[PDB]
Amino acid sequence: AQTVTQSQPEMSVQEAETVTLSCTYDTSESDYYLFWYKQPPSRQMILVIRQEAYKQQNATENRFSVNFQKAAKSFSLKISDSQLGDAAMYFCASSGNTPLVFGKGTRLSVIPNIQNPDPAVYQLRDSKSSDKSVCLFTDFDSQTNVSQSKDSDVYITDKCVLDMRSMDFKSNSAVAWSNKFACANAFNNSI
Amino acid sequence: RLQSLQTYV
Amino acid sequence: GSHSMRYFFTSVSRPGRGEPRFIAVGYVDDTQFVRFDSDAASQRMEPRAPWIEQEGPEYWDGETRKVKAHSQTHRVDLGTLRGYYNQSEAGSHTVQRMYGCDVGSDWRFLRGYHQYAYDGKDYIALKEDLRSWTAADMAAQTTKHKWEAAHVAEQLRAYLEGTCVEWLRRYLENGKETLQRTDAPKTHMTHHAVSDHEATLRCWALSFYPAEITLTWQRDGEDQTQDTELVETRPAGDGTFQKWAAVVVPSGQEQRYTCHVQHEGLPKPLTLRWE
Amino acid sequence: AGVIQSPRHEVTEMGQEVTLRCKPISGHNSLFWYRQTMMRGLELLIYFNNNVPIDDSGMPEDRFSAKMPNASFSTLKIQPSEPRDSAVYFCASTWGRASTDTQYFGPGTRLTVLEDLKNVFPPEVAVFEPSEAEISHTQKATLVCLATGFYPDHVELSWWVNGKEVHSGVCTDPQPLKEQPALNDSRYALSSRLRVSATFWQNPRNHFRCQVQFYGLSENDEWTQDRAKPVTQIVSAEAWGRAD
Amino acid sequence: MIQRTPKIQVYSRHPAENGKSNFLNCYVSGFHPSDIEVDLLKNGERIEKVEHSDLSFSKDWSFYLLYYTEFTPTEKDEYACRVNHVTLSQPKIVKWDRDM
């Protein structure tokens, strides 16, 4: 009698571009509230937008606007000039017989726009021991796909975008390591 | 059909 | 005709004898059509009219979910209000709530209402404009500020002007034969000698619907309230109503007196005499 | 000054008792319990207004219970725990004047119920100093921290420069990976990078610590394996700045 | 606290016909609080299978209830309604009168 639908479970937006997260809901009431919640990997839930269904006006919060179509039972979330911090799970919710009912959620991934691709592999060594060592694949652009270790004794992580906020610089990086392996051919298959 | 909203005094 | 849907909530604390009893009743015009009783076995919103029985199982699921939750909010309210008034936990106290919507004969929104009472007297109520509050005493001012922060009036207004009227229209169609009828009153006059010299003329009105009727007594074509008894309109128990008027007259003067009946089911107002 | 949840992660063996706990924002008269899985999503379990349960239709059929003894705290109790109960259990509070009041959520409590504790392992931690080839080419310096061989996936990795926790320039893997991917009970590994400018890392007085909070057994849990009891603990690795 | 005495009306659903089956109604109204006990009497005995309607109230917030049961009136059978409420010194009994 009161359901929320988020059909696309995964969405991707290019950094600084705008993205629309769809939501439809089912209710037989005229007094209800609609909400958008954001869940970073922190797991802390925080309110993005609130729409009172009696208020006709599309509620806006800075970059975050909502396309409230009461007739069509649609409540899509528009995120303009997306940023890395927008990467999270977004949950559509509605008031009703249950105070809050959540949708399934959509995971927005924000693709960092690498300004100056500069792919390289470096060798770092342990600061206690000097035997153990890791390999760092960094500074590649965002369309690069890193590949898992088909070598069994080797481990290769996925790509991870870090932000040096006070240098206005952003970089991707993956990490590899092994027991007792060279770094130049450690990402041999990632191409 | 009842109103769904809960109000507390 | 003009119509209305109304809901009535009553919660009665009973310290030491269990949880408070909660009764919820639903009305279209003078016809009760739903019911919930917290002491009853079913623990469900039950139908009390046949035309509501053609609502599906999901309707009854949702009405049951709402009324079960509403029973508990009012259980809380009893405790909240008890504190507002510095009252001991020994006494039985009462919470009452009533809301609904009136529609004109064009079936579009006419008037909305939402009233709260604590211990039989006014507590807080919505004003006719459905935008502000009337707090009765100073304790109710606490609730007024609470409900103005939560923007409660704007939410009730949304229900009354929307869900309330639109489901009232659906009920008026679902039970057109029951809810849209007018039953003209079955009227007769009785004469009961009680004295050597004095008599009672009783003027009956039976099996009418709706409950709005007017019975007045006339002597020599002039209105008279002196020496008249009127009983309040009562239900027959089958969806119709009854009311009667009586006057005490001296014997041999009976046919000076005429009874008059006004009801929307009658094309002309009836006049009755003793014959 | 927010919704307090006690504790962050919790690891229990099946059959034991679990008592999640939550404190609402002071002044709030309503409190909600949710649980989050990725199978079913976010589901309401029970909520209270003025310590009275308003609805518990969302509570499991048989081993779950909830009390709100006073306005200051509420407990959710599973008895006995089962692996199907593994989820993040969120608490939220509202002012309690209307069911449309906005809900203020807590950080959650991630509960993991294992079939037995014999495979619980603390993490090993190492910091790897930046490549000087990176320093020469980019004028930036990427440290790396490896959290290795832990189970279950109950680690909290933070970086600590000169005593203050750092988020800027940090990147931690969203998922761990299996050290032996053929195994279901395989232990996990997690990496993290911290990128500073070359001059900052070239300062011999800058101190870099990688801290990994692991949530494992209490000392009330029993243990009879040929290794150190994998209790809840912190494992750190560190490194100083290098001029050359 | 406001306290309101009930008004009692005992009557039949249809005009009384000796030997014909009918319904005996007792309508208590305008009372407060809602705690009320209502029985229907057949010659001083509590008729036991008596149903009632659901508690509602009017604009002055006072409550009202309808108690009804199946009965077949005769000429010398005496029916009545016994009401007990906190506002009464003792249970009020109102005799049924087919003229009323």
Author numbering:
A (entry chain D): 1 to 180, 183 to 193
B (entry chain C): 1 to 9
C (entry chain A): 1 to 275
D (entry chain E): 2 to 245
E (entry chain B): 0 to 99
What did the article's authors report about this structure?
Here, we studied an HLA-A2–restricted spike protein epitope (RLQ) that elicits CD8+ T cell responses in COVID-19 convalescent patients characterized by highly diverse TCRs. TCR RLQ7, like TCR RLQ3, was isolated by screening CD8+ T cells from COVID-19 CPs with RLQ–HLA-A2 tetramers. To explain the ability of RLQ7, but not RLQ3, to tolerate the T1006I mutation, we determined structures of RLQ7 bound to RLQ–HLA-A2 and T1006I–HLA-A2. These complexes show that there are multiple structural solutions to recognizing RLQ and thereby generating a clonally diverse T cell response to this epitope that assures protection against viral escape and T cell clonal loss.
To understand how two TCRs using completely different α/β chain pairs recognize the same RLQ–HLA-A2 ligand, we determined the structure of the RLQ7–RLQ–HLA-A2 complex to 2.78 Å resolution. TCR RLQ7 docks over RLQ–HLA-A2 in a canonical diagonal orientation, with variable α (Vα) over the α2 helix of HLA-A2 and variable β (Vβ) over the α1 helix. The crossing angle of TCR to pMHC is 39°, which is similar to the crossing angle of RLQ3 (36°). The buried surface area of the RLQ7 interaction with RLQ–HLA-A2 is 2217 Å2, markedly higher than the RLQ3 interface with RLQ–HLA-A2 (1659 Å2). Hence, the germline-encoded CDR1 and CDR2 loops of RLQ7 dominate interactions with MHC (50 of 68 contacts; 74%), with CDR1α and CDR2β making the greatest contributions. However, RLQ7, like RLQ3, interacts extensively with the HLA-A2 α2 helix via CDR1α, CDR2α, and CDR3β, with Tyr33α and Thr101β forming three side-chain–side-chain hydrogen bonds with Gln155H that link the TCR to the central section of helix α2: Y33α Oη–Nε2 Q155 HLA-A2, T101β Oγ1–Nε2 Q155 HLA-A2, and T101β Oγ1–Oε1 Q155 HLA-A2. In ,addition, Ser30α establishes four hydrogen bonds with Ala158H and Thr163H at the C-terminus of helix α2 that provide further stabilization: S30α Oγ–O A158 HLA-A2, S30α N–Oγ1 T163 HLA-A2, S30α Oγ–Oγ1 T163 HLA-A2, and S30α Oγ–Ν T163 HLA-A2. Most contacts between RLQ7 and RLQ are mediated by Vβ (48 of 68; 70%), with CDR2β and CDR3β accounting for 26 and 22 contacts, respectively. TCR RLQ7 engages all seven solvent-exposed residues along the entire length of RLQ (P1 Arg, P3 Gln, P4 Ser, P5 Leu, P6 Gln, P7 Thr, and P8 Tyr), whereas TCR RLQ3 makes no contacts with the N-terminal portion of the peptide. In the RLQ7–RLQ–HLA-A2 complex, CDR1α engages the N-terminal region of RLQ via two direct (Ser28α Oγ–Nη1 P1 Arg and Asp31α Oδ2–Nε2 P3 Gln) and three water-mediated (Glu29α Oε2–H2O–N P4 Ser, Asp31α Oδ1–H2O–N P4 Ser, and Asp31α Oδ2–H2O–N P4 Ser) hydrogen bonds.
